[PDB]
């Protein structure tokens, strides 16, 4: 389990805002950091960075922004980002309503301006097709030139009944049963005109609506695909308690459901073993279920008193079996659900509530962020944190 071997590597805080997304490129040679706006705050640099692991350098990008009430541009929250499968480009989404495409030197190569409200989520297919979930209730599918980054095609993913109800598209994932079927696009909806929403499926090659998944209208908060791609979980908030659904990728049917007393679910997952399901909430704890006895929780994994939104980091160690969660006590806790007491150890402690945490797919990196702009990077490289050197 690589997590024991990860040692502090780099610390960074030039951040305007809180860092709320991190990405690694397929090769795990470069990473990118997106943070929020801060409404009254000075931010020369921020909120969009690209770093390089070999050179230990980092560069601030032109990013997303609007002109504030003084005529002086202010940065817009980065809502998602992901590196291209060809390793040349970075795709970003923000609260300026735009999808942008950047090359590895920070040059803007492409832009999608059709959306009329905040971008909320991005997903990327095996063939580098980009799915976009927009606050206006539309999803979009975008293709990009492999060598130039220019946006080549777009397609609207429209679920008219959701749109009638004024829902926002806020979650999005591709699905193809590990390459054994054609690409479908799952979209999760929620409602800011206020706990309603829904979960729908689209065909990606035709860009057409296929079905509503069989749940009540509920605000979906999180989507997680098992690494085997045999199934995924989706969590929602309801008028009362929260719910988690387990959905099969052959039938595209709801197979199992769990209920929790958590009133706001931030993240649901499935274990790497494929058998456990988790729900981490604003209550600063994670409920866990054995899917073969879904009646009652198997365990309850608690964090401590807030340093100040509860659990903002929840991931299984890639390639391993340990579960890792980060909460508003500022602690990253390590758990083994196969032990009678699952708590293993505190991995680290940050100066304030955790805002994001994520492993690289090759398990060689862990990045953890907290309120106030701190970003800690841990690597299989040892006692103290170094710095990146900022470049232009
Ligand atoms: Cl269904």
Swiss-Prot record:
<dbReference type="GO" id="GO:0005634">
    <property type="term" value="C:nucleus"/>
</dbReference>
<dbReference type="GO" id="GO:0140720">
    <property type="term" value="C:subtelomeric heterochromatin"/>
</dbReference>
<dbReference type="GO" id="GO:0005721">
    <property type="term" value="C:pericentric heterochromatin"/>
</dbReference>
<dbReference type="GO" id="GO:0005829">
    <property type="term" value="C:cytosol"/>
</dbReference>
<dbReference type="GO" id="GO:0140727">
    <property type="term" value="P:siRNA-mediated pericentric heterochromatin formation"/>
</dbReference>
<keyword id="KW-0963">Cytoplasm</keyword>
<keyword id="KW-0804">Transcription</keyword>
<dbReference type="GO" id="GO:0043494">
    <property type="term" value="C:CLRC complex"/>
</dbReference>
<protein>
    <recommendedName>
        <fullName>Rik1-associated factor 1</fullName>
    </recommendedName>
</protein>
<keyword id="KW-0853">WD repeat</keyword>
<feature type="repeat" description="WD 2">
    <location>
        <begin position="260"/>
        <end position="299"/>
    </location>
</feature>
<dbReference type="GO" id="GO:0000785">
    <property type="term" value="C:chromatin"/>
</dbReference>
<feature type="repeat" description="WD 4">
    <location>
        <begin position="349"/>
        <end position="385"/>
    </location>
</feature>
<comment type="function">
    <text>Component of the Clr4 methyltransferase complex (ClrC) which contributes to the establishment of heterochromatin by specifically methylating histone H3 to form H3K9me. ClrC preferentially ubiquitylates H3K14 and ClrC-mediated H3 ubiquitination promotes clr4 methyltransferase activity for the methylation of H3K9. H3K9me represents a specific tag for epigenetic transcriptional repression by recruiting swi6/HP1 to methylated histones which leads to transcriptional silencing within centromeric heterochromatin, telomeric regions and at the silent mating-type loci.</text>
</comment>
<dbReference type="GO" id="GO:0030466">
    <property type="term" value="P:silent mating-type cassette heterochromatin formation"/>
</dbReference>
<keyword id="KW-0539">Nucleus</keyword>
<feature type="repeat" description="WD 3">
    <location>
        <begin position="309"/>
        <end position="345"/>
    </location>
</feature>
<feature type="repeat" description="WD 1">
    <location>
        <begin position="73"/>
        <end position="112"/>
    </location>
</feature>
<dbReference type="GO" id="GO:0031509">
    <property type="term" value="P:subtelomeric heterochromatin formation"/>
</dbReference>
<keyword id="KW-0158">Chromosome</keyword>
<keyword id="KW-0156">Chromatin regulator</keyword>
<keyword id="KW-0677">Repeat</keyword>
<keyword id="KW-0805">Transcription regulation</keyword>
<dbReference type="GO" id="GO:0045141">
    <property type="term" value="P:meiotic telomere clustering"/>
</dbReference>
<dbReference type="GO" id="GO:0034080">
    <property type="term" value="P:CENP-A containing chromatin assembly"/>
</dbReference>
<comment type="subunit">
    <text>Component of the Clr4 methyltransferase complex (ClrC) composed of at least clr4, rik1, pcu4, rbx1, raf1 and raf2. The cullin pcu4, rik1, raf1, raf2 and the ring-box protein rbx1 are components of an E3 ubiquitin ligase, whose activity is essential for heterochromatin assembly. Interacts with nup189.</text>
</comment>
<dbReference type="GO" id="GO:0031934">
    <property type="term" value="C:mating-type region heterochromatin"/>
</dbReference>
């Amino acid at each position: 389990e690589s997590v024991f071997f990860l040692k502090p590597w780099k610390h960074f805080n030039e951040t305007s805002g809180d860092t709320v997304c991190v990405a690694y490129n397929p090769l795990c040679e470069k990473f990118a950091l997106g943070s929020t706006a801060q409404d009254g705050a000075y931010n020369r640099l921020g909120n969009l960075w690209i770093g390089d692991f070999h050179s230990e350098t980092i560069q601030s990008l032109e990013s997303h922004y609007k002109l504030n009430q003084v005529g002086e541009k202010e940065y817009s929250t980065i809502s998602d980002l992901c590196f291209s499968k060809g390793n040349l480009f970075l795709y970003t989404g923000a609260f300026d309503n735009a999808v942008k495409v950047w090359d590895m030197e920070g040059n803007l190569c492409g832009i999608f301006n059709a959306p009329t409200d905040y971008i909320h989520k991005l997903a990327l297919s095996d063939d580098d097709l980009l799915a976009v979930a927009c606050k206006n209730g539309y999803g979009y599918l975008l293709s990009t030139d492999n060598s130039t980054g220019e946006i080549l095609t777009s397609a609207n993913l429209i679920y008219p009944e959701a749109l009638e109800k004024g829902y926002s598209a806020s979650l999005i994932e591709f699905s193809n049963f590990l390459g054994r079927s054609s690409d479908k696009v799952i979209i999760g909806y929620d409602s800011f005109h206020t706990n309603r929403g829904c979960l729908a499926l689209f065909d990606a090659s035709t860009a057409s609506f296929v079905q509503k998944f069989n749940t009540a209208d509920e605000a979906f908060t999180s989507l997680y695909m098992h690494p085997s791609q045999v199934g995924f979980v989706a969590s929602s908030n309801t008028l009362s308690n929260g719910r988690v659904y387990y959905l099969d990728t052959r039938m595209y049917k709801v197979c199992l459901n769990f209920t929790t007393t958590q009133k706001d679910i931030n993240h649901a997952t499935i274990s790497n073993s494929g058998i456990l399901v988790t729900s981490s909430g604003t209550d600063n704890q994670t409920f866990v279920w054995d899917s073969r006895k879904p009646d009652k929780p198997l365990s309850l994994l608690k964090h401590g008193k807030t340093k100040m939104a509860g659990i903002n980091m929840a991931q299984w160690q890639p390639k391993g079996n340990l579960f890792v969660t980060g909460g508003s006590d500022g602690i990253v806790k390590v758990w083994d659900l196969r032990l009678n007491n699952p708590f293993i150890q505190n991995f680290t402690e940050m100066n304030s509530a955790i805002t994001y945490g994520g492993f690289s797919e090759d398990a060689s990196k862990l990045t953890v962020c907290c309120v106030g702009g701190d970003v800690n990077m841990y690597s299989l490289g040892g006692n103290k944190f170094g710095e990146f050197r900022i470049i232009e």
